Design a protein around this ligand. Structure first.
Ligand SMILES: CSc1ncccc1C(=O)N(C)C
Ligand SMILES: CSc1ncccc1C(=O)N(C)C
Lengths: 329, 329
């Protein structure tokens, strides 16, 4: 039912957007079909955890506060696709960064703009008569801004914006929080509260704290898998070492490395050479980082498992969806 | 006074945005100064015609409907900078299209996202208590969407989105209308009406028609200058022929060329070779396109000079600013 309903609303949203282009923006059929394929390629095929989380928050709140049921759930589905389209937008922007005018790059830039604009167009249409439309747009735009700021923190973590000084745990958490947690964990919860009209009924402090912690938990595991999970099992080629990323492994290693090891880490980090990357993996191994990884996640899990309880003391139904969200993590 | 006030509000807007980053987004000084320089580099130095047009529309309407004066004019200045920041955003995106992770491209993509997000942040702050905030955001987002659609029309005018068939005058006007006229001509007028509270008092049909015509007038001259005005006088190297652009010259030539000339045009268009570009300029000359250019602009000017009168029959003060805007064109 959840996934089936999410996909039906995708067809409805897509058909509105494409007909709007045909009927109001003078678009020719060849380009409409081109954009339908681009939308399908970039928005479909993931796990939809961000979008389905909006649905789950919405259904948990209509069970603990007929016609309002159907409207809120449909609104939850449109909000889920807003976040999924926003995610598709970030992925396209990421692909440009590592990919006679080159029309494929021109079309990639254009795709990224269209995907973001479509979040606005689908909200303005489907929520035109909702009282929360203005607050919805503002919180959505603020989270999107936050994500772009987090991307700046991430991309410049090894230089001086006109260098391992910013390789600290607090900066690592700043990157995770702004670059990932806000739009991936906080935003689905907030939107589920907005369409459920129950926004001012929750402790947003605990809610923000949980979203940040859950993003941190997921990103630490992601960082360790990027380095140790082999590509055919990870689903991609891990490249954090080559890319000099401010990863959990890097910042944890630098806190417990010896002076000559840090020299060896610094001499080998951020290189595509197979032996230097292997040297970094070797250093991580010797420092027992995969052992510290288990303890770190355990401590985070304890903070999460205990923070949902504060939340449920005044917002019981909200906590069950946050628990399901955390369970997926 | 107009330019002086526009620049003072720039400092106010910039200081709000940078302090917000420092105070609410955990940004370090090095990055704040980096973003201040980027903002200055990308947003300042133009002619500010889009932004000042908002101011001019606002002052013309408070003279023909003390405290409301100062508030509306300040709102007009924030709106002007919204459009100027949006323009800076499009220019950055354009530069990426024709410009080991490459951090300059990463930072260019990031700049483009920040510049767009800043239009939302400055609106949400300075208009937080305005009744028009929701309508303002929606019309702004719709024009931005329109511009991205026009960019798609422009970039794909020579191919089949998975070719001179789309080299027609009606498609040329579709490109100009969506890619330029809406955000450059229509949007400043609309925003000036919104902050002046006089939006539902104007004939939006005539207003849209004027904005489209004025964009067309300006783009036709731009197209002819791109081909014939030498670089040190044009301010850039004209490259429409090399880039196979659907320009006014191209579509006008194809309507009056002979079969063997179209073969010669088709064989030489869209090439960087100096002789093929010169062959295209030669063909344009022989067809007396610079003579037809004068007549075309004259006819457009007549439609403009006569459409402002319909506008002033019910919206007199609005027409004087539209006249000043047209005068700049
Ligand atoms: C638990 S996985 C998840 N849960 C909620 C939203 C998004 C995700 C996700 O797919 N990533 C990669 C974080
Ligand atoms: C008349 S020039 C102008 N007027 C109003 C808004 C923008 C402009 C402009 O600079 N271009 C390049 C169109």
């Amino acid at each position: 039912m959840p996934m089936q309903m999410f996909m039906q609303v995708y067809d409805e949203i897509q058909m509105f957007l494409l007909e709007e282009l045909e009927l109001k923006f003078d678009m020719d059929p060849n380009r409409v079909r081109y954009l339908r394929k681009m939308m399908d390629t970039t928005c479909l095929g993931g796990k939809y955890n961000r979008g389905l989380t909006v649905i789950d928050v919405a259904e948990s709140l209509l069970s603990l506060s007929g016609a309002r049921r159907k409207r809120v759930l449909h609104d939850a589905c449109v909000c889920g696709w807003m976040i999924e389209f926003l995610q598709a937008h970030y992925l396209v922007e990421d692909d440009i960064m590592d990919n006679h005018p080159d029309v494929t790059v021109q079309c990639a830039i254009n795709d990224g703009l269209l995907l973001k604009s479509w979040t606005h167009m689908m909200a303005m249409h489907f929520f035109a008569d909702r009282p929360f439309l203005q607050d919805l747009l503002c919180r959505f735009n603020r989270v999107d801004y936050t994500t772009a700021v987090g991307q700046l923190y991430d991309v410049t973590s090894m230089f001086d914006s006109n260098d391992f000084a910013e390789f600290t745990l607090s900066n690592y958490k700043r990157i995770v929080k702004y670059k990932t947690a806000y739009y991936t964990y906080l935003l689905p919860l907030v939107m589920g509260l907005i369409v459920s009209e129950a926004l001012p009924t929750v402790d947003m402090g605990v809610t923000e704290e949980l979203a940040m912690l859950m993003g941190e938990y997921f990103q630490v595991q992601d960082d360790v898998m990027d380095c140790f999970t082999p590509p055919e099992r990870l689903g991609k080629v891990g490249t954090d070492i080559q890319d000099a990323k401010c990863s959990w492994l890097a910042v944890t290693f630098l806190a417990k490395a010896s002076s000559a090891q840090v020299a060896e880490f610094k001499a080998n980090y951020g290189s595509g050479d197979s032996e230097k990357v292997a040297t970094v993996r070797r250093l991580y191994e010797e420092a027992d980082l995969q052992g510290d990884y288990v303890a770190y996640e355990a401590a985070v899990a304890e903070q999460v498992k205990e923070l949902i309880e504060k939340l449920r003391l005044c917002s019981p139904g909200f906590a069950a969806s946050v628990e399901t969200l955390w369970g997926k993590t």
